[PDB]
């Protein structure tokens, strides 16, 4: 196995760290590769990739509420955009710290829509998530005016050997009188007290909404998001119940039909 | 950029590490 293949594997592992365990996974891989130069040069991308993939929320000094690190905010040169506070900031992927906030020109013909959606979503997120954060981007892709709503929520409890994270990304492609709606909802949970058990799930959403006033549409968008996310959470709950009451039970009995543990001398006859 | 900066997996305990080993078997190719 070549050094190039070793570092590709190292980068892959790093990018597959479960939520809240990036440092542990990074350290393991670093000690296994045992070549800091190779790691630096061949897995440099892996830190940024992971953070943006995970919608890592970061706190900026002087601004309440946090902002999500996502591909949509990547300003290059190690800086990221906070469309709500109209700022750019430096972000260190390794130390996961923001620094050097600077006013950033955010003006756009999407400006007022991004803002109406953002204020509505922020309220939706405070209500629906215990530890939620959201970042809404307004940009033109392929000339099409698009609102990109990103939601993150996590609960890290390494001391109880578990971490979990929700991520949702909603894309509204505006084409009056109708907006095209695409979304990906994701959940990952990791439990590892004397084991390694993980829930991995995601659902793709495809839909459309009537577009009207800036304010009314925001209401429409958030209503779509709410119905979809509740539906998904409900379906997940339904799967758990079915896995518990049907599949798990059928895999192994609690006790043999005798309703007593096995008499092993008998079995040996 | 510094890597000793990033701390730190104090490793979990590994129950499978101490099971009886059956030494002296050919590896797969």
């Amino acid at each position: 196995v070549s050094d190039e293949e070793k570092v590709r594997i190292a980068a892959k592992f790093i990018t597959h760290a479960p939520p809240g365990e990036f440092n542990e996974v990074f350290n393991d891989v670093r000690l296994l590769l045992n070549n800091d130069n190779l790691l630096r040069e061949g897995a440099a991308h892996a830190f940024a990739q992971y953070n943006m993939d995970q919608f890592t929320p970061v706190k900026i000094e002087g601004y309440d509420d946090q902002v999500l690190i996502t591909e949509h905010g990547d300003l290059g040169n190690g800086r990221f955009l906070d469309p709500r506070n109209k700022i750019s900031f430096k972000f260190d992927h390794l130390r996961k710290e923001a620094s050097d906030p600077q006013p950033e020109d955010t003006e756009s013909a999407l400006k007022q829509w991004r803002d109406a959606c953002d204020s509505a979503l922020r309220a939706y997120v405070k209500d629906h998530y215990p530890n939620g954060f959201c970042t809404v981007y307004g940009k033109s892709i392929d000339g099409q005016q698009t609102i990109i709503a990103c939601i993150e929520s996590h609960q890290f409890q390494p001391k109880n050997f578990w971490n979990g994270r929700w991520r949702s990304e909603w894309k509204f492609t505006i084409t009056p009188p109708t907006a095209q709606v695409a979304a990906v909802l994701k959940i990952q949970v990791h439990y590892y007290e004397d084991g390694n058990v993980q829930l991995v799930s995601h659902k793709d959403i495809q839909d459309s909404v009537q577009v009207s006033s800036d304010v009314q549409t925001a209401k429409e968008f958030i209503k779509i998001i709410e119905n979809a996310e509740n539906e998904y959470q409900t379906a997940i709950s339904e799967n758990y119940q079915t896995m518990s009451d049907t599949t798990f039970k059928a895999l192994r009995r609690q006790l043999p039909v005798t309703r007593t543990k096995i008499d092993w001398n008998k079995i040996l006859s | 950029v510094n890597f000793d900066d990033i701390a730190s997996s104090e490793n979990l305990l590994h129950l499978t590490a101490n099971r009886p080993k059956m030494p002296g078997r050919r590896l797969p190719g």
């Binding site: 949970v189 058990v197 059928a250 895999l251 | -």
Partner: protein, 238 residues
């Protein structure tokens, strides 16, 4: 080092859904740990067919030699081998005994699936693995699989038993719900005990009760962790 410790730690964290690819990636990353990783990283059990006896048997590292695997029924390697590692005559007789006993255990608790027991000599006794593999019938669009890997060390009037048991549990469904949902992985537990060895309480009975007690316990714990704990975590995400 320490590389072994990190390797195991990494397998505790990388998604179990890619458990097989994880291991071979890890072997590629650190070629020198190959034997250690192959023996300490548990993997889903594979079913092979013993053409001679017309019975299924389970593949894992413990019945492997080179690229071939030993059937517990015919006591032969497939692909055939000139000098494959075999159990002594004494231990082979016990192994056949254990396979017969755990076959009935399998039927009693799992009402299906496949079982296999492989034994091997130790300095002051012997060890063995008891493997059970059971696939779900796929009802309600849920695919399920249960793997038992019970590894026992016996130090031989009375004997000391050390049991390290891993159960793997995989649940998956692709309802439009819901979208893709995968809930899987494994738990490991360990027990030790001295017990009398006698006519009425032979080694196979002693190991039997140990495996049964352990597995009943783990079944209950899987229920709590999979359907209690991970669900509670989801609900608080929320």
């Amino acid at each position: 080092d320490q590389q072994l410790d990190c390797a195991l730690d990494l397998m505790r964290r990388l998604p179990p859904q890619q458990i097989e690819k994880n291991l071979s990636d890890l072997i590629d990353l650190v070629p020198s740990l190959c034997e250690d990783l192959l023996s300490s990283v548990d993997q889903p059990l594979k079913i092979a067919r013993d053409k001679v006896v017309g019975k299924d048997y389970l593949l894992c590292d413990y019945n492997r030699d080179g690229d071939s695997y030993r059937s517990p029924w015919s006591n032969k390697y497939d692909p055939p081998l000139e000098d494959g590692a075999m159990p002594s005559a004494r231990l082979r007789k016990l192994e056949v005994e254990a396979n017969n006993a755990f076959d009935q255990y399998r039927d009693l608790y799992f009402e299906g699936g496949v079982s296999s027991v492989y034994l091997w000599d130790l300095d002051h006794g012997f060890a063995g693995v008891i493997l059970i593999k059971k696939a779900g019938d796929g009802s309600k669009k849920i695919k399920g699989c249960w793997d038992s890997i019970h590894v026992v060390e016996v130090q031989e009037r009375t004997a000391h038993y050390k049991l390290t048991s891993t159960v793997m549990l995989w649940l998956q469904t692709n309802k439009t719900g819901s979208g893709t949902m995968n809930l899987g992985g494994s738990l490991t537990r360990q027990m030790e005990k001295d017990e009398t060895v006698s006519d009425s309480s032979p080694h196979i009975a002693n190991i039997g009760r140990l495996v049964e007690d352990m597995e009943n316990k783990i079944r209950s714990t899987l229920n709590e962790i999979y359907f209690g704990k991970t669900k509670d975590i989801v609900n608080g995400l929320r």
